[PDB]
Amino acid sequence: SGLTPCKDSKQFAKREKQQIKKLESSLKLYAPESAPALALNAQIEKTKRRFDNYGKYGLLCGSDGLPHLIVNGDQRHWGEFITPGILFLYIAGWIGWVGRSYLIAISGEKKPAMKEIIIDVPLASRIIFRGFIWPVAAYREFLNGDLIA
Amino acid sequence: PIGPKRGSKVKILRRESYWFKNVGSVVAVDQDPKTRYPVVVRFAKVNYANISTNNYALDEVEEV
Amino acid sequence: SHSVKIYDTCIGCTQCVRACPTDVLEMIPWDGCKAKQIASAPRTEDCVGCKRCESACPTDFLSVRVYLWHETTRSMGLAY
Amino acid sequence: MFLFSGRGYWQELIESIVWAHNKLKVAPATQPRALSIIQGRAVGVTHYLLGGIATTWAFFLARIIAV
Amino acid sequence: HWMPGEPRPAYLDGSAPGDFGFDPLGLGEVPANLERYKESELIHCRWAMLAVPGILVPEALGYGNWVILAIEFLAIAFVEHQRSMEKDPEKKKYPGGAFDPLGYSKDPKKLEELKVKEIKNGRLALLAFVGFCVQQSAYPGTGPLENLATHLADPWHNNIGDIVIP
Amino acid sequence: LRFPRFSQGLAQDPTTRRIWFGIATAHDFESHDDITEERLYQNIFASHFGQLAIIFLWTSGNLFHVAWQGNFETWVQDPLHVRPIAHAIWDPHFGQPAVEAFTRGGALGPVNIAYSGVYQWWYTIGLRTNEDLYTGALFLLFLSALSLIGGWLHLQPKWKPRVSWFKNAESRLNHHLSGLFGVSSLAWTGHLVHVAIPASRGEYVRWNNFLNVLPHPQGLGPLFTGQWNLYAQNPDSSSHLFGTSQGSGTAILTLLGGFHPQTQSLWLTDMAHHHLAIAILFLIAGHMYRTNFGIGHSIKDLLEAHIPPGGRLGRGHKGLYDTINNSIHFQLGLALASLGVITSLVAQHMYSLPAYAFIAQDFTTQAALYTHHQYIAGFIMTGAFAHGAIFFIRDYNPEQNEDNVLARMLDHKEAIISHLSWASLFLGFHTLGLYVHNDVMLAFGTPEKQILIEPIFAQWIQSAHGKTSYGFDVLLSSTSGPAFNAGRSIWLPGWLNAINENSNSLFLTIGPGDFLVHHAIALGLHTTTLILVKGALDARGSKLMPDKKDFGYSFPCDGPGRGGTCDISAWDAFYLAVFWMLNTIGWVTFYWHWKHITLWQGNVSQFNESSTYLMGWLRDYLWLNSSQLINGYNPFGMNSLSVWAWMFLFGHLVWATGFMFLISWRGYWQELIETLAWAHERTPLANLIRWKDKPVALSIVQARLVGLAHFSVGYIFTYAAFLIASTSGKFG
Amino acid sequence: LSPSIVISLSTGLSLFLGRFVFFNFQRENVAKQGLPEQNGKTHFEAGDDRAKEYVSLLKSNDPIGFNIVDVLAWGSIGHIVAYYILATSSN
Numbered sequence A: 001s002g003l004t005p006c007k008d009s010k011q012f013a014k015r016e017k018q019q020i021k022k023l024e025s026s027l028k029l030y031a032p033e034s035a036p037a038l039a040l041n042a043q044i045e046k047t048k049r050r051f052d053n054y055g056k057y058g059l060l061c062g063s064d065g066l067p068h069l070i071v072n073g074d075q076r077h078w079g080e081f082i083t084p085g086i087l088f089l090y091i092a093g094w095i096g097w098v099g100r101s102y103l104i105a106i107s108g109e110k111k112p113a114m115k116e117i118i119i120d121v122p123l124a125s126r127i128i129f130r131g132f133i134w135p136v137a138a139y140r141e142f143l144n145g146d147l148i149a
Numbered sequence B: 001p002i003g004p005k006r007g008s009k010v011k012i013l014r015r016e017s018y019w020f021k022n023v024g025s026v027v028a029v030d031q032d033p034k035t036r037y038p039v040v041v042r043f044a045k046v047n048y049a050n051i052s053t054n055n056y057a058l059d060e061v062e063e064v
Numbered sequence C: 001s002h003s004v005k006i007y008d009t010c011i012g013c014t015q016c017v018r019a020c021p022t023d024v025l026e027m028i029p030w031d032g033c034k035a036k037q038i039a040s041a042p043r044t045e046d047c048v049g050c051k052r053c054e055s056a057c058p059t060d061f062l063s064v065r066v067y068l069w070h071e072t073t074r075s076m077g078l079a080y
Numbered sequence D: 001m002f003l004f005s006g007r008g009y010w011q012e013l014i015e016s017i018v019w020a021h022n023k024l025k026v027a028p029a030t031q032p033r034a035l036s037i038i039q040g041r042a043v044g045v046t047h048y049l050l051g052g053i054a055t056t057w058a059f060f061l062a063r064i065i066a067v
Numbered sequence E: 001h002w003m004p005g006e007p008r009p010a011y012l013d014g015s016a017p018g019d020f021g022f023d024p025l026g027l028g029e030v031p032a033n034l035e036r037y038k039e040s041e042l043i044h045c046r047w048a049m050l051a052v053p054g055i056l057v058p059e060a061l062g063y064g065n066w067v068i069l070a071i072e073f074l075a076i077a078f079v080e081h082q083r084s085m086e087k088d089p090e091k092k093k094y095p096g097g098a099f100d101p102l103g104y105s106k107d108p109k110k111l112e113e114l115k116v117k118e119i120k121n122g123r124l125a126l127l128a129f130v131g132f133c134v135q136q137s138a139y140p141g142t143g144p145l146e147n148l149a150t151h152l153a154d155p156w157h158n159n160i161g162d163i164v165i166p
Numbered sequence F: 001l002r003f004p005r006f007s008q009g010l011a012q013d014p015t016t017r018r019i020w021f022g023i024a025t026a027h028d029f030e031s032h033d034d035i036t037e038e039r040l041y042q043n044i045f046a047s048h049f050g051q052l053a054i055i056f057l058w059t060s061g062n063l064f065h066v067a068w069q070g071n072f073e074t075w076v077q078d079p080l081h082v083r084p085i086a087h088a089i090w091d092p093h094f095g096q097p098a099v100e101a102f103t104r105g106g107a108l109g110p111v112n113i114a115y116s117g118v119y120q121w122w123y124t125i126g127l128r129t130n131e132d133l134y135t136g137a138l139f140l141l142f143l144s145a146l147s148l149i150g151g152w153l154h155l156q157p158k159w160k161p162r163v164s165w166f167k168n169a170e171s172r173l174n175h176h177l178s179g180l181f182g183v184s185s186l187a188w189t190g191h192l193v194h195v196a197i198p199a200s201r202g203e204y205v206r207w208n209n210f211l212n213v214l215p216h217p218q219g220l221g222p223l224f225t226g227q228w229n230l231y232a233q234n235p236d237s238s239s240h241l242f243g244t245s246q247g248s249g250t251a252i253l254t255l256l257g258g259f260h261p262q263t264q265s266l267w268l269t270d271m272a273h274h275h276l277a278i279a280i281l282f283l284i285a286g287h288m289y290r291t292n293f294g295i296g297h298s299i300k301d302l303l304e305a306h307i308p309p310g311g312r313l314g315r316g317h318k319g320l321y322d323t324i325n326n327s328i329h330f331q332l333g334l335a336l337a338s339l340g341v342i343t344s345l346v347a348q349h350m351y352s353l354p355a356y357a358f359i360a361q362d363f364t365t366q367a368a369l370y371t372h373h374q375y376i377a378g379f380i381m382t383g384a385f386a387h388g389a390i391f392f393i394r395d396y397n398p399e400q401n402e403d404n405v406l407a408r409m410l411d412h413k414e415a416i417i418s419h420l421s422w423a424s425l426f427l428g429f430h431t432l433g434l435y436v437h438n439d440v441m442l443a444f445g446t447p448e449k450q451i452l453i454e455p456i457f458a459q460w461i462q463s464a465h466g467k468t469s470y471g472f473d474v475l476l477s478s479t480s481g482p483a484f485n486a487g488r489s490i491w492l493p494g495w496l497n498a499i500n501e502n503s504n505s506l507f508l509t510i511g512p513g514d515f516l517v518h519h520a521i522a523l524g525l526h527t528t529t530l531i532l533v534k535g536a537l538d539a540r541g542s543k544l545m546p547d548k549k550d551f552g553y554s555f556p557c558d559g560p561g562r563g564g565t566c567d568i569s570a571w572d573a574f575y576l577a578v579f580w581m582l583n584t585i586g587w588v589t590f591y592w593h594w595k596h597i598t599l600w601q602g603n604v605s606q607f608n609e610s611s612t613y614l615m616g617w618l619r620d621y622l623w624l625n626s627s628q629l630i631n632g633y634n635p636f637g638m639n640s641l642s643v644w645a646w647m648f649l650f651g652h653l654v655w656a657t658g659f660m661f662l663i664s665w666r667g668y669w670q671e672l673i674e675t676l677a678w679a680h681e682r683t684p685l686a687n688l689i690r691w692k693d694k695p696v697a698l699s700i701v702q703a704r705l706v707g708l709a710h711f712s713v714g715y716i717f718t719y720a721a722f723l724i725a726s727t728s729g730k731f732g
Numbered sequence G: 001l002s003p004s005i006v007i008s009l010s011t012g013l014s015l016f017l018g019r020f021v022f023f024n025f026q027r028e029n030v031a032k033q034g035l036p037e038q039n040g041k042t043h044f045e046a047g048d049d050r051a052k053e054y055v056s057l058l059k060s061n062d063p064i065g066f067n068i069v070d071v072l073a074w075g076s077i078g079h080i081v082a083y084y085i086l087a088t089s090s091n
């Protein structure tokens, strides 16, 4: 959509050069072997590697020199939004399933409210491993009809 | 004996009650033919006034 | 003044009568409950509307209800 | 939000939220309650003072160090 | 029946002609809906059966492929309005009367067997028309007979792999 | 009975609450003493007449003051280098430097520059001199007098309409559709053809000669013979100068599309055709319903027969006709929703497709009209939801509407409310997170780490409309498509030329900042809807207060029992939603103003680069553009922007004053007034004077209303001052 | 090119269709839906003295009951279509 790749972005190169020039301005103030100078020299390399990696991944830059993210579902940009999205969904489902399974276990007690303050660690440690298979567990429970009260 | 047997589980049908469509345990029922709300029910959840006991009529209680 | 109404879900525990700071309510005999009594509101012209009576009713919903209405000197709590 | 508003609205909102939680058997045994009348006042003034004092602090410190 | 091992819906007992207990969506629960759907299905079957040879015959006779007006509008509107004016549920699906001078309604069992055969052939013709319509999209400007000839060139397979996976 | 005479309860009140509540409850006809349905309807009729009387008077003042103290004749000659004048200034407090500083335009004294855009509208519709404005003012005065006379006459006992006349819904719809909407548009087309177009082509048509001038050389011949194409031949040339005959055509009904090259507004021959088509459609649509002539539809049977056979909607629409007809708050709620939607649409369309000559080059006028009509829409929407809640409280009858769509609405209110909560939380969480991430990333000196997301879907829509700034090549942007070939020879060239001109506001270019601000707007809309819908659905009662319907629409609270019941009435849900409405409209107007000012300055890259983090908004928009406004008066002197600085400070003061009513509550002030009353009573030479009504503090509900009024007034005045000062300090 | 005076034979065809083929259908729906009502009563019997149906205009001597109202309703359709053909052509 009028976007150019990072590796061929003159404004991207200008941003990198300007940041490096600004960083090197403070390097001249200290002795070359001093600890502040050693710490500063490690910052320039980090900037260089970051810019190289951004160029190497085929990110798209506009007229500003800043990368843009395409989330329409293009197969060449699945790492921007699609790939991290499924990971977040899996992790959030794990957390939710563990939290839901803990409450059901203690609901049958005489005083279920007491277990919400003093957490039963031996009981909680067993349920934690069970969240690994939460997609299959939820898929099977939905079909059987036990998901909704 | 008039009313549901004590110890049973009952469902509340009163519209304005905090425990509408909830299940409670019968504590006692009054055998006096003049009492208007003899059935005494006890609930696990307290209402907004921190009370878990209330009296209901015969037609406000459904036996589950 | 305000309007105070008493309904038949009363159990006659006498808390509202003790909570009134203006002597509006009183208890009368009534064979409709175990306590054989029910509350009454004969002097509603002295009610100020502080609703201390409703904070004392223990039923699922209040057996004593206060509805605010035309306000006078007595119901405004004015001393000047 | 705490200074301008009241307690009944939030209790009713929490009622709807609790219904949606009950629908999926994730209803906590400790019934959620909105903050009391006195607590809602105390929360508002704390944030008010914190925000004002922090704004003035940052403004003064950034201005006077530079010049 | 439609697929063995599946319980049939209560409203499809296998007594109706052409019935095979097919309703994965359950769109025929209401009796009035079932009568309307029966009539609509019959009309669709008859029209498709009347139409398909009129599409095929051109290409076979070499006159071309399948790819006054006021009189036509008047006639069709009048015919459809007059059909809609009928009130009997049974006469709408089968009008009989003088419309069948050949008298093929004399025998009851033969009548029912004819009804089943007509329903089956109507479903087949409807599927054939859907096939024609989808075929025209894949190969524009090519009639079905030319497609059959191209299949005769390579009688191996229904050439969907050339389309589904380009 | 002394005051108010319509309420006995308030008349007996011995305190100052009597006056306040007499003022506040004056127009609530349903709560007055000894009211009836007939009396209520007749009062509403008379009130509507009185309202129509005031609109015609307000319009006449503008015309009279422009004609008497304006420079309309001078502005017409050179529209692009003259400042419109609203009225004159006569203030005895003025100093000598202020008298000379405000003397602008061709006037000989202090004047006010008009930002309402009436000069352009009147110029476009055919007025050219002051005598026309005077005649218009006289006619509007006559109309106002006629409205007042009609109202008085229909308030008389002999001419009082009956209740059954007002409930005749089928006859009213026929007359309002065909007569009010169709004939009016037809008459406006007749005006445009007869007067407006010949005036735009250099010919003067007035009352004394319009019966001797043919609007078209061929007259009415082509219309009856069916040769309607002769009315579109020889259209206006692209070199035409507005108001002069150079390059003018002879067509009266065209479908060119695009903009006039000189005025940058829609062609005058397109408006005539558009209004003709609209008038014909509305005239045809007005014969649907049944009247005394034995043909048509009945709305009662139309609703009753739309019931899905599956039973997934209950009984369907049964009983809704009487529910709508017998309830007046239901009628008012439906009018306000449509009015708000079309007001928003007007605001969105008037800035991108200007209709008036020489209004696209007036930068202050165009920014004021968008902010004016967008703030009104929010208030109308809040009113629609408030009157829906009032209807649910008052007019709803559960037995009549059993198991229809309304009962099923009330049945599952918990599911609707809990989902708007999820949508609002999701939007707010993620929008704030992205904004803060960008803020931190740029604060640490590494702007290349920002999360910038291109709004691909809106860009695709723009490309499908014919914009070629993205290269998607879809639909109208594709020359080989079926869509392009259909209209290539009717309207496509002009529209395509106009849309690809990047100097106007037709489908501007968008980026990540537009994405973020659009999602902020969506969050605001969802949250305001959530508050209003929760109030409306919980108006009848909830678990905390099952019998809320017995206490009316507005009441203070239900005491401190059961944990506390502040702000529990349905009136308090409306009062909370006004803050969110103001916040959302503020976001919308901030976005519009910054984008357009950056476009006008020629440095559109500044918005494209700074809008993505929250420090850019505060530094490059508010701090940067308020430099000229606060310099209205300084220790050295003053200029013509001093009034806007004074308005700025005045709005700040009122907004800050509203906080006192919103935060501090009643019990403190009554205890203060006790001591004040004692002190007055025990003072020599001053206790000879006595009050007649005892002083008391403001009621619980009244204070919320007062604080809200202060808050809103300060908000509006401050933003108006800032907007006008910033936009007119650079472009005039 | 047939002119404006001849193409308006569409009015004749519309009147023919209104009286002979579409007459029965229109009368059935009119009686099925009936007069508009407010609170279970028609507009005239509820008090509105200007909502009484006109029966003098409905009195017709036609064998099937064709009326001037139906004449106007069915002839208005013919003129609209006639001008649609005259306008769509000659572009």
Ligand code: CLA
Binding pocket: A095, A096, A097, A098, A099, A100, A102, A119, A124, D016, D017, D018, D020, D021, D024, D026, F418, F419, F421, F422, F425
């Ligand atoms: C594990 C517990 C748990 C689960 C399964 C849910 C599930 C749900 N909540 Mg929820 N909620 C929770 C805890 C939980 N909540 C807590 C503790 C709070 C108070 C902070 C809320 C406050 C809340 C609101 C205000 C709303 C929901 C809503 C919802 C529903 C929409 C989906 C969603 O994620 O909303 C988003 C949920 C959140 C943003 C909550 C934050 C997540 C918390 C921090 C996780 C806490 C986990 C806890 C420590 C478990 C410990 C387990 C351990 C013993 C092993 C969904 C059914 C929405 C709805 O549909 O209406 C009811 C809604 O509007 N929730």
Ligand code: CLA
Binding pocket: F044, F045, F048, F049, F052, F165, F166, F168, F171, F172, F175, F176, F179, F180, F184
């Ligand atoms: C031809 C018949 C006719 C006409 C013209 C009217 C006209 C009117 N009636 Mg009415 N009425 C009629 C028959 C008619 N009635 C009949 C038969 C009945 C009995 C069934 C009634 C019963 C009745 C009642 C009970 C009431 C009215 C009222 C009104 C007035 C409402 C004002 C209005 O709509 O704003 C005019 C609105 C528009 C023209 C359209 C606004 C919306 C559009 C979409 C906006 C378009 C704007 C456009 C872009 C131009 C703006 C730009 C510009 C600023 C430059 C209006 C004068 C009300 C009243 O009393 O008013 C005094 C009222 O209460 N009528």
Ligand code: CLA
Binding pocket: D001, D004, D005, D013, F421, F424, F425, F426, F427, F428, F429, F432, F527, F530, F531, F576, F577, F579, F580
């Ligand atoms: C800047 C002020 C402000 C803010 C941030 C909010 C925010 C919110 N309001 Mg709100 N409101 C405000 C002013 C504000 N309001 C005012 C002035 C009024 C008028 C009185 C209202 C009236 C109002 C109503 C009537 C309603 C809301 C609701 C909401 C919530 C829904 C919006 C959303 O998406 O949540 C986004 C969430 C956030 C912005 C919270 C972010 C906080 C972060 C994540 C915490 C980070 C962790 C923390 C720092 C660690 C703790 C450290 C320790 C030292 C404390 C949201 C929390 C609605 C609600 O609650 O229903 C859902 C609702 O119904 N508001």
Ligand code: CLA
Binding pocket: F653, F656, F657, F658, F659, F660, F663, F664, F672
């Ligand atoms: C900017 C907002 C604002 C303003 C102006 C005020 C003003 C005031 N507050 Mg206050 N307050 C505020 C916000 C504000 N408060 C907030 C947010 C809170 C927290 C809830 C409080 C809490 C608070 C408390 C708790 C108390 C006050 C009190 C007072 C009064 C102090 C005594 C006095 O007369 O002062 C002098 C008055 C002024 C400075 C205002 C007038 C300014 C100019 C001179 C107006 C001149 C206009 C002139 C008459 C011409 C008008 C003519 C007309 C035709 C237009 C004063 C009126 C106290 C009180 O009751 O009095 C003892 C008190 O006890 N306030």
Ligand SMILES: CC1=C(/C=C/C(C)=C/C=C/C(C)=C/C=C/C=C(C)/C=C/C=C(C)/C=C/C2=C(C)CCCC2(C)C)C(C)(C)CCC1
Binding pocket: F329, F330, F333, F334, F337, F341, F384, F385, F387, F388, F389, F391, F392, F536
């Ligand atoms: C053609 C076209 C189109 C279309 C579109 C559309 C179709 C849209 C729609 C839209 C819509 C569709 C909207 C809506 C809205 C809504 C609203 C705004 C609502 C409101 C509501 C309310 C206000 C309520 C009230 C109430 C209540 C609450 C209760 C009681 C009752 C009542 C009613 C009163 C498009 C553009 C695509 C494209 C181009 C062309």
Ligand code: SF4
Binding pocket: C004, C019, C020, C021, C022, C023, C024, C025, C046, C047, C048, C049, C050, C051, C052, C053, C054, C066
């Ligand atoms: S409202 Fe207060 S004064 Fe009135 S009866 Fe109740 S407790 Fe007594």
Ligand code: SF4
Binding pocket: C009, C010, C011, C012, C013, C014, C015, C016, C017, C038, C039, C056, C057, C058, C059, C063, C064
């Ligand atoms: S009003 Fe309440 S407290 Fe008083 S007797 Fe009745 S139930 Fe008891």
